[PDB]
Design an enzyme around this catalytic site. Structure first.
Site, PDB file in Angstrom:
ATOM      1  N   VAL B 142       0.865  -1.242   0.119  1.00 56.98           N
ATOM      2  CA  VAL B 142      -0.104   0.178   0.079  1.00 56.98           C
ATOM      3  C   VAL B 142       0.755   1.133   0.139  1.00 56.98           C
ATOM      4  O   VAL B 142       1.661   1.331   0.885  1.00 56.98           O
ATOM      5  CB  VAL B 142      -0.811   0.212   1.112  1.00 56.98           C
ATOM      6  CG1 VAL B 142      -1.890   1.299   1.256  1.00 56.98           C
ATOM      7  CG2 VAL B 142      -1.795  -1.139   1.163  1.00 56.98           C
ATOM      8  N   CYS B 143       0.584   2.121  -1.028  1.00 60.10           N
ATOM      9  CA  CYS B 143       1.701   3.196  -1.330  1.00 60.10           C
ATOM     10  C   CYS B 143       0.757   4.523  -0.902  1.00 60.10           C
ATOM     11  O   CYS B 143      -0.156   4.736  -1.665  1.00 60.10           O
ATOM     12  CB  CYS B 143       2.236   2.866  -2.586  1.00 60.10           C
ATOM     13  SG  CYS B 143       2.926   4.485  -3.386  1.00 60.10           S
ATOM     14  N   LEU B 144       1.315   5.442  -0.218  1.00 66.62           N
ATOM     15  CA  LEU B 144       0.856   6.567   0.105  1.00 66.62           C
ATOM     16  C   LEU B 144       2.178   7.550   0.349  1.00 66.62           C
ATOM     17  O   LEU B 144       2.990   7.075   0.881  1.00 66.62           O
ATOM     18  CB  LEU B 144      -0.177   6.739   1.504  1.00 66.62           C
ATOM     19  CG  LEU B 144      -1.390   6.310   1.485  1.00 66.62           C
ATOM     20  CD1 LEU B 144      -2.191   6.686   2.528  1.00 66.62           C
ATOM     21  CD2 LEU B 144      -1.954   7.175   0.180  1.00 66.62           C
TER      22      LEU B 144
END
Ligand SMILES: O=P(O)(O)O[C@H]1[C@H](OP(=O)(O)O)[C@@H](OP(=O)(O)O)[C@H](OP(=O)(O)O)[C@@H](OP(=O)(O)O)[C@H]1OP(=O)(O)O
Ligand SMILES: Nc1ncnc2c1ncn2[C@@H]1O[C@H](COP(=O)(O)OP(=O)(O)OP(=O)(O)O)[C@@H](O)[C@H]1O
Lengths: 988, 291
Positions: B142-144
């Site tokens: 999960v990329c933020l």
């Protein structure tokens, strides 16, 4: 260049420097301690030819300074140069070493020196040094000249490289890369850097451009810059060029620099000294004055001053006053420095000699290669702080007694020497710094007392071929042996009375049982020579819990640092929590690379995933379930399984022989370097635009392009061979070296087709097909697991990684990288060299004396150095910090509260006891990472009525545990005030 | 109905569950599947102390500030002893392809927290075979921006002084699960409003709808995780009628484009898969006992 021996040094010097190092002859005169150190460092460096020269004979006094002589050599009255010839050649068989004993005097013919290219002088009278320096600088080409000397606790270093010297690399840092954002058709033009990422440039540097759209005239040109803002600079007129469209990459260009030196005789009237301590910028001039006065006195009276004879001190002071007024700058005369120089004129301090030797060896390397900026033009190191705190000692304490420690006793006095022989010191790690520290310990007689004294060294690693370059205590016939035992055996030969206890454990939380608190209490000082920060932090936390001094040091290439930690006076290692480091974004690493590092990292990760993680998952899955028929039945019953699809897919595509392995490698190549580009282009066509209209395929993104396979290309052949070998090894398929021939590969691939480019039922069908084919045997459910081994030249790991990275880079049109750079980047190899390690070891040895003596806070120093500039900085250690919480109560990092309980003690009793004893009430109790009492979370309200013994579940060996607490803030909504750790005793 | 749903679930937002058991040897035995096993076992260092204070402070906020509504809610579970282990369940918002889903995440706190952001991993990937969002890779990453540390922008990083876990959760729920996930990808927003963009968005939405119906409701009901078992059973029992209506509407809408040629085959395939999933989901819901 056999890389197996010079792997670490190449990353520092460079290939051209290595080539110039060969075919060089160095003449070294004077075989005292300093000359021996210089010779050792030079031989380890790898100079082709070294000639040592000396004329005196061994004496018992020499045993305290030379770590190669022996009692037999003293008995036989051998020449000093010859008695060390055999041992020195043992350091490196590639170096040709010869000895000479021609006398030196005024009438000696200096014609024979022209053969050599660098001259080092040690323990020489001044007038002959003047004559030699005058002769050398007048040669065509000039011959480099270096002089060095050590007297007592003062040192002097000098350099002269002729009238004009040329440097091919000013600093040695790799040039950075920047991305142009905008250019202006103005006179002068203005160049704007991309968003963020400051250029970090300065005016006067030179840049070159490439890949510029529109302004094609600037591609391949060179310009000189002028910084205007942190995000922009200036370039010359561009009004005659086309408008700037987009793109553009600029890289810094290195420029040769010319420096000037002067003759020694001229330099003696106003030296250009180098400042190492900014608190006393005028110190070097006074030290120079005192040294010159000492040399004049030695010439006049043909002897050195005797300790304690005040008339000698008066004569030296008068001479120093006479000289000082003759100097151009006319400084003052420091009476204290003159007095102390007179006091210890006949001494000799080993660690100072080691540090000066390291610096001098670095200077000689600069002279022969021209790699870095040379020193200009003097260097004065001293350790006056050691005797500054002694007050007014008696002269009898410094008189010689007739043993091997006469030099050290004349240096620091008898009492401190005796306090040195009774040390119990614990040493962690036995790397490059460890061997130097052991040599220093042997020279100083650390722990040699019969009654008390012990040195403990622990290291789990084994001797490796590349380690022989830096650590001199090891030999080629010591490969694959414990470092600790070999180091102990080597050290015992230097000094017979040394008592060393060696271990093989690795300092970690798991082995804490043996290294209990009693062991730390027994020790008196802890020295670290580690290479990773986690071990440093763990050791620091351990030492913090027992109030024990800690010394830490570390090096990287030509940079090094030292740190000193003292209980109740200075901050700890963890007080310096360092900033983190940029990590490549997931999207740049996976699909949008921009530099060779990205492709190398991608290749490394692909190797790891393909050869380590998947085999482990396969073995674990097939050991979880006994039989494949059971798995099929469970699947047919709808039962879910973890990762079933991946393992069944791996099973379906299992190779069976060599040809299948080759075909699998070919398909992997096609999928990796052909289909990804087509897929990426299909998802994002080249002409797609964003909202603002800019092209999506703009900087720093680079468009990809497919690569067609061709067996004639050497890179393609290398990748195919390495992939085939690795897959054959993993699937345990036997193979022979003849099958790696080009012709055999051509024959196998002649009948392999390539598919063009464009679940539960399929998996069940494939599993059933495997079952009916009797492919589900016990041997079939087994896969070998590989591990990364960068030091093996036949496992093919590095070849595969390099081939994959180069292919991916050429897909994205990026400059490829060779084997050595790829190896260094993938393995995260830290470059290292002998000079810096020797220097930092000497400095740590110096600081240990101050730690042992119990000197006040002002005596300790921290050093940061970079020999490439060169630059040396000494600062005072960081002072301890007061921290308060409430009601005026304050604490330091060294504080620790205590609570005594009994068998029936409860948590409420503990809280009330702390509240009564110290005045405030804690609000949360946590044991390490496992909590004990947090009011917010449910179920902890009832915990207040439990026995502490149950709640802690301790071990019977430990009579106490450590807890962390916190206190409610004065104002609600704020973070709780931290508190000092609390130690709880189960019973009295 | 919504008031009753809020009232019942409000007692289950935060609690503790037993995940790790320690033997006499100090070895760690995990009773539930956890993505960060290796990091937990290796990182046994007890030097960290500020992390405990930060987590204790955060526990005050997490006990009351979690979003809770009929459209979306968050549930958190943490270990009975350790503090660096957590599992998060998020229900997808309404009027989106992720409507009324049940997605599970794994959160681990490094030793140097809060100097570094925590690690988050998505677990409802369906065996890595599904990419639920352009920001949700099929491998589970999960990329933020807030969870990443790079050049970027000073206000687009993990700031130790101001950044908090609650911000991470709210950001995930508000920015990842949106109305039209197809346009989250930069470079496609230029084609917004064009017929081709609309067709592509419809195809993507159909794929996501079928995938979430498969791997977010049926699999969760059949094989719930031990930690969130009661929450799952109470959640699906209360919203069966709405789930049936939503599935019927989704089936009806997909076939409206089956007559197209460019995407007709994909639409028909998606509709068939959705019908096959719904046939079994109906039986599964009919057999659910009352909690
Ligand atoms: O397991 P990974 O290291 O993450 O690599 C995978 C893997 O490729 P390899 O098995 O060739 O290494 C996938 O293939 P499967 O094993 O799952 O069949 C492939 O998927 P495709 O076959 O659909 O290309 C995927 O590529 P992608 O994410 O583009 O689908 C690719 O990931 P990376 O090469 O980017 O690591
Ligand atoms: N936790 C630890 N406990 C004990 N020794 C350790 C620990 N961590 C590192 N070491 C030791 O630190 C030493 C570091 O030595 P050095 O920096 O010269 O390089 P190296 O580890 O031998 O290898 P290379 O130079 O190839 O990196 C090694 O000998 C290693 O065994």
């Amino acid at each position: 260049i056999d890389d197996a021996l010079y792997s670490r040094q190449r990353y520092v010097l460079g290939d051209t420097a290595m080539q110039k190092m060969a075919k060089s002859h160095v003449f070294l005169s004077g075989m005292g301690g300093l000359g021996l150190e210089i010779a050792k460092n030079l031989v380890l460096a790898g100079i082709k030819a070294v000639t040592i020269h000396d004329t005196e004979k061994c004496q018992a006094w020499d045993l305290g300074t030379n770590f190669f002589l022996s009692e037999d050599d003293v008995v036989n009255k051998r020449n000093r140069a010859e008695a060390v010839l055999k041992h020195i050649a043992e350091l490196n068989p590639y170096v040709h070493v010869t000895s000479s004993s021609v006398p030196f005097n005024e009438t000696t013919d200096l014609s024979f020196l022209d053969k050599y290219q660098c001259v080092v002088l040690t323990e020489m009278k001044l007038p002959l040094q003047k004559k030699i320096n005058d002769f050398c600088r007048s040669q065509c080409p000039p011959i480099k000249f270096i002089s060095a000397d050590v007297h007592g606790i003062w040192s002097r270093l000098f350099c002269d490289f002729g009238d004009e010297f040329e440097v091919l690399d000013t600093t040695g840092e790799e040039p950075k890369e920047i991305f142009i954002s905008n250019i202006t058709q103005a006179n002068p033009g203005i160049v704007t850097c991309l968003e963020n990422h400051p250029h970090k440039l300065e005016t006067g540097q030179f840049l070159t451009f490439r890949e510029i759209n529109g302004m094609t005239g600037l591609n391949g040109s060179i310009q000189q810059i002028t910084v205007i803002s942190p995000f922009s600079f200036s370039i010359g007129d561009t009004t005659e060029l086309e408008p700037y469209l987009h793109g553009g990459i600029a890289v810094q260009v290195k420029t040769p620099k010319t420096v000037f030196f002067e003759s020694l005789e001229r330099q003696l009237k106003h030296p250009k000294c180098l400042i190492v301590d900014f608190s006393n910028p005028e110190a070097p001039l006074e030290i120079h004055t005192a040294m010159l006065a000492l040399d004049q006195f030695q010439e006049k009276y043909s002897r050195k001053p005797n300790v304690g004879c005040q008339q000698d001190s008066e004569e030296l002071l008068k001479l120093a006053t006479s000289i000082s007024e003759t100097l151009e700058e006319k400084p003052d005369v420091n009476a204290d420095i003159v007095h102390w120089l007179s006091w210890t004129a006949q001494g000799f301090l080993s660690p100072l000699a080691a540090a000066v030797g390291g610096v001098a060896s670095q200077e000689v390397l600069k002279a022969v290669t021209g790699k870095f900026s040379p020193l200009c033009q003097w260097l004065y190191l001293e350790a006056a702080d050691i005797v500054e705190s002694l007050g007014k000692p008696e002269c009898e304490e410094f008189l010689p007694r007739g043993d091997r420690y006469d030099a050290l006793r004349a240096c620091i006095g008898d009492t401190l020497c005796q306090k040195l022989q009774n040390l119990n010191i614990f040493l962690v790690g036995c790397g490059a710094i460890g061997c130097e520290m052991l040599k220093n310990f042997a020279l100083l007689g650390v722990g040699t007392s019969k009654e008390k004294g012990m040195i403990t060294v622990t290291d789990p690693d084994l001797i490796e071929k590349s380690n022989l370059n830096r650590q001199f205590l090891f030999r080629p016939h010591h490969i694959q042996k414990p470092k600790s035992y070999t180091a102990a055996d080597a050290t015992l030969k230097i000094n017979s009375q040394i008592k060393i206890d060696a271990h093989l454990n690795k300092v970690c939380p798991t082995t804490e049982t043996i290294y209990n608190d009693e062991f730390y209490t027994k020790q008196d000082v802890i020295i670290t020579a580690l290479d990773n920060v986690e071990a440093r932090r763990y050791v620091d936390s351990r030492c913090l819990a027992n109030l024990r001094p800690l010394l830490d040091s570390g090096t990287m290439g030509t940079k090094g640092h030292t740190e000193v930690i003292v209980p109740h006076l200075t901050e700890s290692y963890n007080s310096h929590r360092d900033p983190p480091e940029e990590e490549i974004p997931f999207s740049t690493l996976k699909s949008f690379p921009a530099a060779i590092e990205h492709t190398i990292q991608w290749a490394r990760d692909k190797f790891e995933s393909s050869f380590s993680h998947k085999p482990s998952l396969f073995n674990k899955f097939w050991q979880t379930y006994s039989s494949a028929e059971e798995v099929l039945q469970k699947i047919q019953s709808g039962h879910s399984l973890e990762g079933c699809f991946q393992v069944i897919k791996l099973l379906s595509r299992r190779p069976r022989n060599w040809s299948q392995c080759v075909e699998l490698a070919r398909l992997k190549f096609e999928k990796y370097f052909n289909h990804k580009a087509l897929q990426l282009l299909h998802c994002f066509p080249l002409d797609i635009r964003l909202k603002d209209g800019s092209l999506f395929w703009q900087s720093p993104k680079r468009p990809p392009s497919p690569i067609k396979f061709d067996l004639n290309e050497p890179l393609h052949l290398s990748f195919l061979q390495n992939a085939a070998k690795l897959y054959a090894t993993v699937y345990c398929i036997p193979f022979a070296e003849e099958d790696l021939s080009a012709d055999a590969l051509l024959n196998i691939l002649s009948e392999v087709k390539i598919q063009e480019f464009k679940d539960e039922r399929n998996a069940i069908f494939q599993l059933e097909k495997a079952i009916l084919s009797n492919e589900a045997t016990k041997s079939d459910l087994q896969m070998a697991v590989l591990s990364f081994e960068k030091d093996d030249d036949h496992n093919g790991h590095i070849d595969f990684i390099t081939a994959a990275s180069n292919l991916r880079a050429k897909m994205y049109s990026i400059e490829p990288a060779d084997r050595f750079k790829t190896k260094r980047i993938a393995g995260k190899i830290i470059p290292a060299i002998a000079t810096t390690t020797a220097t930092v070891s000497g400095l740590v040895a110096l600081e240990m004396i101050k730690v042992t003596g119990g000197y006040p806070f002002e005596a300790y120093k921290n050093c940061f150095l970079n020999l490439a500039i060169p630059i040396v900085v000494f600062t005072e250690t960081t002072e301890v910090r007061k921290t308060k919480i409430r009601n005026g109560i304050s604490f330091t990092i060294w504080d620790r509260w205590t609570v005594h309980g009994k068998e029936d003690f409860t948590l409420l009793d503990f809280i009330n006891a702390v509240k009564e004893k110290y005045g405030i009430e804690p609000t949360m109790v946590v044991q390490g990472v496992k909590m004990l009492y947090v009011p917010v979370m449910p179920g902890h309200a009832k915990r207040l009525k439990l026995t502490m013994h149950k709640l802690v579940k301790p071990t019977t060996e430990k009579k106490y545990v450590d807890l962390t607490v916190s206190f409610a803030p004065d104002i609600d909504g704020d973070e709780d005030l931290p508190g000092p750790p609390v130690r709880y005793y189960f019973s009295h | 109905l919504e008031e009753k749903y809020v009232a019942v679930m409000k007692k289950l937002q935060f609690d503790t569950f037993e995940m790790v058991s320690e033997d006499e040897d100090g070895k760690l035995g995990f009773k539930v599947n956890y993505h960060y096993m290796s990091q937990v076992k290796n990182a046994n260092d007890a030097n960290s102390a500020a992390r405990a204070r930060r987590l204790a402070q955060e526990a005050v906020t997490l006990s009351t500030s979690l979003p809770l509504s009929s459209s979306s809610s968050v549930f958190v579970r943490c270990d009975e002893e350790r503090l660096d282990i957590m599992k998060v369940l998020i229900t997808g918002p309404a009027d989106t392809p992720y409507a009324n889903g049940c997605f599970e995440f794994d959160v681990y706190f490094p030793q140097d927290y809060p100097s570094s952001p925590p690690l988050v991993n998505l677990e409802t990937t369906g065996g890595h075979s599904v990419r639920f969002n352009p920001n949700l890779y099929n491998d589970g990453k999960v990329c933020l921006s807030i969870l990443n540390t790079w050049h970027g922008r000073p206000e687009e990083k993990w700031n130790p002084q101001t950044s908090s876990f609650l911000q991470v959760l709210v950001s995930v729920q508000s920015l990842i699960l949106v109305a039209e996930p197809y346009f989250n990808e930069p470079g496609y927003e230029r084609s917004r409003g064009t017929p081709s963009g609309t067709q592509s968005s419809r195809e993507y939405d159909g794929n996501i709808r079928q995938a979430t119906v498969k791997w977010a409701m049926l699999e969760q009901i059949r094989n719930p995780s031990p930690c969130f078992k009661e929450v799952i059973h109470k959640h699906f029992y209360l919203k069966r009628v709405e789930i049936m209506a939503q599935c019927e509407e989704w089936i009806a809408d997909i076939q409206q484009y089956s007559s197209d040629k460019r995407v007709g085959r994909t639409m028909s395939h998606h509709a068939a898969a959705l019908k096959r999933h719904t046939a079994q989901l109906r039986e599964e819901l009919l057999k659910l006992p009352c909690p």
